[PDB]
């Protein structure tokens, strides 16, 4: 099903891209959890405010292949994130937020670890995490 989709570049998930946040470790279930509650408390603290805040959740569609993760805005169809899978450290669902999924990755210019959170609309977080694991696998295996 999903697994056959990732290799064939056909695998997609409807999502809400919450945004990125610096995190202090490359892997970790609580590092993720933290990053999710930060973004959810950044969006929430700024509620009611009328204007552009730095950090507003964005409805988009997430594509998962062996080459990278891409999130294309459903609204503008602009490629918002084109992340190569080889500079990806970790990914995970959220123990206390069932719709949540995130992945950590290294950014070599800033020389830092960066979490990237999403909230799935029609699916559970673990289906997504699994899909990205299939990506991880496909990558690791021919190399």
């Amino acid at each position: 099903t999903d697994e056959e989709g990732v290799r064939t570049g056909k695998c997609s998930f409807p999502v809400k891209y919450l945004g990125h946040v610096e995190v202090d470790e490359s892997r970790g279930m609580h590092i993720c959890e933290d990053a999710v509650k930060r973004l959810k408390a950044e969006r929430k603290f700024f509620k009611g405010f009328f204007g552009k805040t730095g950090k507003k959740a964005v409805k988009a569609v997430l594509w998962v292949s062996a080459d990278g993760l891409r999130v294309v805005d459903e609204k503008t169809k602009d490629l918002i994130v084109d992340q190569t899978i080889e500079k990806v450290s970790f990914c995970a669902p959220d123990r206390n937020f069932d719709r949540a999924f995130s992945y950590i990755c290294r950014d070599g210019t800033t020389r830092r670890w960066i979490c990237h959170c999403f909230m799935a609309v029609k699916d559970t977080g673990e289906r997504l995490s699994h899909a990205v694991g299939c990506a991880f696998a496909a990558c690791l295996e021919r190399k």
Binding site: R27, C91, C105
Partner: peptide, 7 residues
């Protein structure tokens, strides 16, 4: 989970 190919 899972772990990634970086590192």
């Amino acid at each position: 989970a899972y772990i990634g190919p970086y590192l």
